[PDB]
Amino acid sequence: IRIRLKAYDHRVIDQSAEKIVETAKRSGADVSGPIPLPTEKSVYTIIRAVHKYKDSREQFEQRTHKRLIDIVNPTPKTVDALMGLNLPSGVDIEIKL
Amino acid sequence: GQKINPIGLRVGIIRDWEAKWYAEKDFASLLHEDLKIRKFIDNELKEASVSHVEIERAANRINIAIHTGKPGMVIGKGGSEIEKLRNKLNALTDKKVHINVIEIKKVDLDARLVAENIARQLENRASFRRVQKQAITRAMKLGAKGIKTQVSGRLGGADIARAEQYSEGTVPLHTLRADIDYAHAEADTTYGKLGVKVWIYR
Amino acid sequence: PRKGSVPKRDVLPDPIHNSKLVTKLINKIMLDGKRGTAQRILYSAFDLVEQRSGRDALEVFEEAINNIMPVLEVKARRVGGSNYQVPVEVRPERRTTLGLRWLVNYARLRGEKTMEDRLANEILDAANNTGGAVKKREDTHKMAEANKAFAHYRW
Amino acid sequence: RIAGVDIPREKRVVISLTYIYGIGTSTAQKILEEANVSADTRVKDLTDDELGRIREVVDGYKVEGDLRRETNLNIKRLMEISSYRGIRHRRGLPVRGQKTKNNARTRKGPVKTVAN
Amino acid sequence: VEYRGTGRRKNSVARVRLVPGEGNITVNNRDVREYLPFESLILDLNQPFDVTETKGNYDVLVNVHGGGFTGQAQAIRHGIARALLEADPEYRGSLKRAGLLTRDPRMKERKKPGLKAARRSPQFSKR
Amino acid sequence: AKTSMVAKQQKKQKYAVREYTRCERCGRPHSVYRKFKLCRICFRELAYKGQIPGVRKASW
Amino acid sequence: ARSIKKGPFVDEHLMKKVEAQEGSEKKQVIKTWSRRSTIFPNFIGHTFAVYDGRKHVPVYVTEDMVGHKLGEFAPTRTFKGH
RNA sequence: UGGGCACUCUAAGUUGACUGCCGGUGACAAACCGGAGGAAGGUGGGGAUGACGUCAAAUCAUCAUGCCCCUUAUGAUUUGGGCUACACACGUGCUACAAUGGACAAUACAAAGGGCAGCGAAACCGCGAGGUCAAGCAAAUCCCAUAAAGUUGUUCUCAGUUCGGAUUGUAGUCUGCAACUCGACUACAUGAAGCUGGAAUCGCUAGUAAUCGUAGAUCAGCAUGCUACGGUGAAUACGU
RNA sequence: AAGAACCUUACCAAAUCUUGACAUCCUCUAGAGAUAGAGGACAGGUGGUG
């Protein structure tokens, strides 16, 4: 019942925070609010120069945003409508079930 | 080292990624598949006015959206040409049936198309000043707020590298709330390589 | 500096004796951010000078500080091949900074066993107009006494 | 004095006994476990019956002379068979494999400088 | 009757619960003189208790986590002032005069690239 | 030299301590990341166009 | 170095050309490339031409040398002063 | 821990700090000084952002590339060695020359990360490195993991010492086909120079200088290097 | 160079090879190991000139 989503972009995880609670309320079912889970920041530090010019570093990040939505009353119309995930090809879905 | 890359600076803020997919694991192989597709597209669709290539992945299926200034040249006479593109990509690893062709109506308003158009004329013994000025004139005529062009290295066949830079209008490369299309192209001549950079701001 | 004046960071009164002067003495004894030791150094010396002299720990300290604080400094001017040592009266705020500094420095330069006893020894000596701390101000006054001829070169 | 090597008096047993070659602090703490000495009594406050207990334990370990002789024949053997460690012993160079290019002074010895 | 006044200093957050009663200061269910190693921290902790006269009139049930002890002590102090107004909101007339309701932003510094760690620079010589 | 050491790295070596990592895009044997299998140079160029998902300039 | 469970190390081919000839009386000048093999107790009265990198320096193996690898007995670098 | 989700956190949206304001100096206007809220006041503090150009600055060894050469070699596969060699000089750091300390025992307070055939609990053995079995965790859930400086006591009593741990000897642990060249460590023995550094020199006006540990990238193994994270933490800065 | 026991190594000494280490179309046995036995236009060059 623990539907969790991981996304690189915070906008598609906010949209994924919604749009599935709405297909949960499409049937008669109570769903827990989108739980803001701590994002995971991966930081990379590389030398800008192609050779020797150190102390000039370009820093890059990659934030994996996370959400938790819990269905509290799983009805049959929710397990059939659980495939209506409108994933923009970049939002990972993990339904614990 | 003076100017930050305009695309890299604005990516995530106002620009969006080309490779739009998630991979907690197997990221290295999935990413290198993207470059493998893009590199194959680069030479196969060389004479087609291809500007951007977006690779999307969902349900073990690779979605490719190729923005081109010459639709029909990529698609074919109803789909024959795009079919060869799809199956040639199809032979590589998995299936990638989704290929979408997007028309680029204002070819002279795309940095990659303008830069490539400039670079191909430069290879055909053309004036390094006329190609810049004429291309700049077309974009400003098309409503662009400002265009900046630069051609570098052995201009006209000289023994010393130079850099002819011409600009018109407004091209603020310090403002972040502004979409400046930037692209770099190479023109391999008998005297060496050339460097073309275009800054089209709309 | 060039643009106006710089506000100074203030201290709170001492936990025990309720004196901002006492807390700043801790800030001088402290090395490498170690407050713990510096706090123990002073209280092991304030309570120690009470056994030597007999009077209040803060009362002897106030007497000693007065006998370290300098009244006339010597700032340097320049005309050319001769450097003008111009005597300048010390502003009240700098006097306390110099008096506290000379207490610590001339306690460190001495030695019996530890820092607490050295500090306590120097505190009592200062109230008796003896020690390096009071010998530093006697030389500071002396240089100001000698160079009164350069008084009117005070910028 | 233990077996010819006099230890500093007015010192604690655990501290004074390390003055003997071949005995360190960890070894010294071992004596006071066997010999019933509180590890805090000064050698000058020590009792003769405590000395006997200590001395009986000491010779059990490789205390003096023997350890000096042992360490020498070990290096002498390395000298005879001309290994990597042992040839560097002859030349006064770090035998473990440390960097001799710029920083080796406790083996090279005094800095006999060459002018430029 | 818990007057919840939050307080943050450096990397510490203190959940101050003012309750009526004359007693000790219980930091994380522990006496302030057993919790804070030094008394100088205990003086800075009772600064808003002294600026406006409420010394020891409350048993602060504080739940602090994060930082060291000085950061926790001033996070309690800041939380106490934000809780003294929770009891009587006519207390700011002296708290703003002594600057106790302001979150102190003197948090640490970034490790600046090109320079040795923080704002200082490494050794410099001439070739 | 290139095109021989790259093939050698691609070729499976005898032991598990002989293999090493090279930037698959360019062949650089130094400073190659594992999450992208790219060197610090190839990482910069590809991240500037936006061909590495989710990677953006850090400005904390 | 090694362990007690792993024990001593001799190259899988090296001892094979040692217990090859021990049933004979005469030792040989076997050319050697493995500098990492421990000099075993059965290595006794045997010249091992160990490769220093350019040459095969010979070494008559005595009892004392058992324990160290034959690489310790093959000087690789050369130095005649400064 | 049942239960709540109150507080705090977590992450999305959304307020606020704009010379709005109140005076007074300029009403040549901009501006400037003080004051009021207010968490924050004058670009609120930091980061990213580096114009024309300059130095034929650096990179043909990331890559590509005009030209010039090798092309049974200037190309190519293997084992060994070397890249770590040592008369010395230079740059950058680490460690100390102790008493604000050494040691000895108890006793606290973080942040930020990483992790699937990885992190690896708990138990057992070993002086210790470590090993044997192992639960859990694809992780705000389990593991790295314990911060240490810090506090409290005891012991030493200024000594090349109970400071210092360089260098050697012995016996071992892990990783790896393989630690000799040339790995990290662990025990026992040893115990160097070094008693705060000459002329010269650099850094810095706050959470800075100084000081203590933690994490990560690379990575079978290997950091006193680098990048990040917090804890304690000065003060005069009058003045030109 | 954000990782030299082999590798990395581009350097050296041996054992070697030449349409090649790579394009593009046309389980035992010695042996350090490579490798060996048995169950053709072209390539390439960390070569030079920043």
CSV table of C-alpha atoms (C1' of nucleotides) in Angstrom, one decimal, chain D residues 12 19-20 22-24 26-27 42 67 74 77 88-89 94-101 106-108 112, chain H residues 84-90 155-157 161-162 166-170 180-183 188-192:
chain,number,residue,atom,x,y,z
D,12,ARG,CA,58.1,4.2,40.3
D,19,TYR,CA,65.4,2.2,31.8
D,20,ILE,CA,66.8,-1.4,31.3
D,22,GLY,CA,65.2,-4.7,26.2
D,23,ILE,CA,62.3,-3.9,28.6
D,24,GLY,CA,59.6,-1.4,27.7
D,26,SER,CA,54.2,-2.9,28.3
D,27,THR,CA,56.8,-5.5,29.5
D,42,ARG,CA,59.7,4.1,44.5
D,67,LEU,CA,68.7,-8.8,23.1
D,74,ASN,CA,69.9,-10.7,12.7
D,77,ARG,CA,73.0,-12.4,8.7
D,88,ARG,CA,71.1,-0.8,2.5
D,89,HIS,CA,72.4,-1.5,6.0
D,94,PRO,CA,66.4,3.3,4.8
D,95,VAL,CA,66.1,-0.5,4.4
D,96,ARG,CA,62.3,-0.7,4.6
D,97,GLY,CA,61.9,1.2,1.3
D,98,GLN,CA,61.2,4.8,2.3
D,99,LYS,CA,62.0,7.5,-0.2
D,100,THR,CA,65.7,8.4,-0.1
D,101,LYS,CA,65.4,11.1,-2.7
D,106,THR,CA,68.3,9.3,10.7
D,107,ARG,CA,70.0,6.9,8.2
D,108,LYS,CA,72.1,9.2,6.1
D,112,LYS,CA,77.3,16.7,4.0
H,84,U,C1',59.7,5.0,-5.3
H,85,A,C1',66.7,5.3,-7.8
H,86,C,C1',70.3,9.6,-3.8
H,87,A,C1',76.3,13.8,-3.2
H,88,C,C1',72.3,17.5,-2.2
H,89,A,C1',69.1,22.2,-3.1
H,90,C,C1',64.0,24.1,-3.7
H,155,U,C1',49.3,10.1,38.6
H,156,C,C1',53.6,12.4,37.2
H,157,U,C1',56.8,17.5,39.0
H,161,U,C1',61.8,13.3,31.1
H,162,U,C1',55.8,9.1,32.1
H,166,A,C1',61.9,9.1,13.6
H,167,U,C1',64.8,4.6,12.7
H,168,U,C1',66.0,-0.6,13.3
H,169,G,C1',65.1,-6.0,15.2
H,170,U,C1',61.3,-10.0,16.0
H,180,C,C1',61.7,-8.2,-2.5
H,181,U,C1',62.2,-4.0,-5.4
H,182,C,C1',57.5,-0.9,-3.9
H,183,G,C1',50.9,-1.5,0.2
H,188,C,C1',56.8,-6.9,21.6
H,189,A,C1',61.9,-4.8,21.7
H,190,U,C1',64.6,0.1,20.4
H,191,G,C1',64.4,5.0,20.9
H,192,A,C1',67.0,9.6,16.6
